[PDB]
Amino acid sequence: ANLWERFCNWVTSTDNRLYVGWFGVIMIPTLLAATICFVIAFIAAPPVDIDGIREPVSGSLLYGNNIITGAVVPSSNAIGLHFYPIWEAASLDEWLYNGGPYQLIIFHFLLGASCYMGRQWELSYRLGMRPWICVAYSAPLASAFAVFLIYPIGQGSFSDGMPLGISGTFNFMIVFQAEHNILMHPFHQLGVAGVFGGALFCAMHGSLVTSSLIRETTETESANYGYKFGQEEETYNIVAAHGYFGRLIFQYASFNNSRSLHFFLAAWPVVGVWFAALGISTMAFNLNGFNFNHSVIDAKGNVINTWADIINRANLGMEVMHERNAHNFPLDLA
Amino acid sequence: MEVNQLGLIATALFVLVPSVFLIILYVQTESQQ
């Protein structure tokens, strides 16, 4: 009946329309702060000197961007990995010029999203569920840590963190390919197998269950009315679905066990995206994709180009053009 | 910014025409017995 006891009961209550919980106590203020700053900056922030060379890049709608080009621009290369909260600036005008909003957003976001993951554990415990949905979510979350925090740490600057915008995302990807040959890295290749395969198995599972729906409706009703929320019987015939797919390939290539099947559907994209995240997080320390430049040589010693050498030529074009005013010395060492 | 003058009417009708189509269908569903 004491206030702290009552408060704890409301916080951890399974009857709130949206679950709060103890992770929620951190998640809710941090995500609101990141969301509010992001929206205001995306609409109205002035240009940001991302590369620390007094060459401010315009990210906001009011300063000449559309939805595709706009961004919240990473903080200045002059800051590096230094902590740049609002109270470190002499003024909000300075804070904006130097990319302050970016640090505020990504730090509140990363904390809030980590708490989002813990909150998934927490509610599952309160509902008497098994606990590992939060483990599935760790794959996208690790990917966010990779591009907003780990890659900046390895390279020594939040100015190399992924920008908060659509074209800025493409800028990060192209420069990443120039500096790490990520396409030739096996962890990114596993990532592609993860998302291509995830999309494939998503369509596959969707089509197989849809194909074996038991007739419960008339020609004029949507078949979705054949399922009632919370009914005890399964709504499709997995024996028919397996009988179809096992004949499409061969019997043993198909799942008849729904638990095995759904475990596979969870594991394949999650594992692949884990390797994607580890790809970014280890190229953060410059262990890069395979380099077969000039690997094939004829009897005299003439280089015989392969498709790897053509990739290299494309990478070079990205390399020499990116941040065209920021390099004074011949090697791009970070 | 020198944007296309037809962009506004294009975006407005792109939203409004299918949106009102859905609202019409939703509301007459609600009003059925």
Partner: peptide
């Protein structure tokens, strides 16, 4: 004009989130 248009669409989506969550068709066990 463009900025107003972009922010308007965004604002409609956020409003849609609110109604879709709090004014959803309630799931009923039948």
């Amino acid at each position: 004009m463009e900025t107003i248009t972009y922010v308007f669409i965004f604002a409609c989506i956020i409003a849609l989130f609110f109604f879709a969550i709090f004014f959803r068709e309630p799931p009923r066990i039948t």
